[PDB]
Design a protein around this ligand. Structure first.
Ligand SMILES: C=C1CC[C@H](O)C/C1=C\C=C1/CCC[C@]2(C)[C@@H]([C@H](C)CCCC(C)C)CC[C@@H]12
Ligand SMILES: C=C1CC[C@H](O)C/C1=C\C=C1\CCC[C@]2(C)[C@@H]([C@H](C)CCCC(C)C)CC[C@@H]12
Length: 161
């Protein structure tokens, strides 16, 4: 569904700390409540020397913020990864300048119209306007119905408060 992957991606260079400044999905219910299925908060990106990609994130399960460790496997496409879930879920890196921001989407390899969720990640607990500008543009051609944004204070708390 998304055809804006980034060219020449050097995955190793996205390593470390990241903040989920904004997020969006194709369905309200995906980012609805705090426990919504795709309501995840990224903590750090850990690319293996082997080329795969470890994801450290926070998810609000139960009555608390749970720390999750997910592994997204590399594919023949340097910007696309596959996380081993009950189904085949692809992770796509649309663009990144390595130092300030990174845009990625999570797509379900199903139909009629699979679920889609994208995020605007930034390196610092600051509201980066340009990154959000780019995030908006990239979203223009996508079927989103819910879009969320967080403030600096929320970014420093777990599960964004
Ligand atoms: C796990 C939980 C726990 C939290 C939810 O309530 C239910 C759930 C399952 C369903 C999907 C299955 C596995 C892959 C998904 C799609 C997670 C995905 C690994 C995050 C994409 C990572 C990207 C952060 C870089 C987000 C929701 C997960
Ligand atoms: C209400 C919501 C909820 C939040 C999501 O952005 C999607 C939405 C509605 C539908 C249109 C769909 C795709 C492209 C649009 C037009 C978004 C686009 C990312 C903003 C870039 C500006 C637009 C001028 C072309 C803004 C509204 C989006």
């Amino acid at each position: 569904i998304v055809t804006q992957t980034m060219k020449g991606l050097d995955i190793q260079k996205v390593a470390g700390t990241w903040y989920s400044l904004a997020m969006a999905a194709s369905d309200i219910s995906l980012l609805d409540a705090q426990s919504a299925p795709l309501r995840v908060y990224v903590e750090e990106l850990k690319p293996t020397p082997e080329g795969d990609l470890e994801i450290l994130l926070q998810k609000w399960e139960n009555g608390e913020c749970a720390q999750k460790k997910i592994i997204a496997e590399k594919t023949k496409i340097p910007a696309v990864f596959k996380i081993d879930a009950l189904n085949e879920n692809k992770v796509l890196v649309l663009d990144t300048d390595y130092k300030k921001y990174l845009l990625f989407c999570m797509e379900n390899s199903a139909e009629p119209e699979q679920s889609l969720a994208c995020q605007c990640l930034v390196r610092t607990p600051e509201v980066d306007d340009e990154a959000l500008e780019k995030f908006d543009k990239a979203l223009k051609a996508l079927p989103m119905h819910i879009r969320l944004s967080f403030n600096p204070t929320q970014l420093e708390e777990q599960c964004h408060i």
